[PDB]
């Protein structure tokens, strides 16, 4: 068989390839930014007062 079976055309094939590459780039950038932010927060919070920062509020505010 052949000549077309749930297939696409080259003009649309290249467009789909470019769209997929762009989406993958955006997703990778977002994931890297999120990971960098998480690492920064972990480095800044691991110094001290890990649970006290929330305990003070749980004691002040309504539990």
């Amino acid at each position: 068989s052949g000549t077309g079976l749930g297939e696409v055309d080259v003009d649309t094939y290249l467009s789909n390839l470019q769209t997929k590459t762009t989406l993958s780039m955006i997703a990778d950038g977002l994931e890297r930014s999120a990971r960098d932010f998480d690492a920064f927060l972990e480095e800044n919070v691991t110094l001290e007062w890990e649970a006290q920062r929330k305990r003070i509020y749980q004691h002040f505010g309504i539990k």
Binding site: Y57, F60, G61, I62, K63
Partner: protein, 177 residues
């Protein structure tokens, strides 16, 4: 006592209410001389711990009273001098269970909203800090509004959403951008 303090708190609401109908009032003035407004604003701290239940209904009358004093022009003077902005910050407060949660936020928002728009440009400086320091939270409420328990919950959102809106237009946060 649990019932005496509740009835006494609600009683003061009727006195100040009927007195205004009779721009000043001698009842509100007496409360300031007796150091009642001072200790009253101090109790606002740790409100989360206090908040059908007897403690819940008691707090309702408490915040309800403060809301009335912020409606008269003379109340802004005595109320503002109590430094209520710093009292509500230490507490960290900012289907039926959720409805009660918004009921508390509305009560606090009304007291602050009416207080800023009571005196004039002397309290707008504090209102901007409250919205800027607690930005984002109000944005979620203003966008949410935009079976019995459901309607009751949504009703509080409408009041809560409209509460902050009054403070914005009254404080002039749009000019700050």
């Amino acid at each position: 006592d649990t019932t005496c303090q509740t009835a006494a708190m609600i009683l003061l609401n009727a006195l100040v209410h009927t007195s205004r109908a009779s721009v000043d009032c001698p009842i509100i003035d007496a409360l300031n001389r007796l150091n009642f407004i001072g200790v009253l604003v101090d109790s606002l701290k740790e409100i989360l711990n206090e908040w059908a239940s007897p403690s819940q209904q008691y707090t309702s009358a408490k915040l309800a009273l403060l809301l009335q004093l912020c409606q008269t022009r003379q109340g802004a003077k005595y109320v503002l001098q109590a430094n209520l902005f710093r009292a509500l910050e230490q507490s960290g407060v900012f289907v039926v269970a959720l409805e009660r949660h918004y009921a508390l936020l509305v009560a606090l928002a009304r007291v602050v909203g009416a207080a800023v728009t009571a005196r004039g440009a002397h309290n707008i400086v504090q209102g901007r800090k409250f919205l800027t320091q607690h930005r984002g939270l109000v944005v979620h409420v203003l966008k949410k509004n935009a079976i019995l328990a459901q309607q009751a919950l949504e009703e509080r959102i409408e009041e809560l959403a409209e509460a902050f809106m009054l403070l914005i237009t009254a404080t002039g946060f749009l000019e700050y951008e």
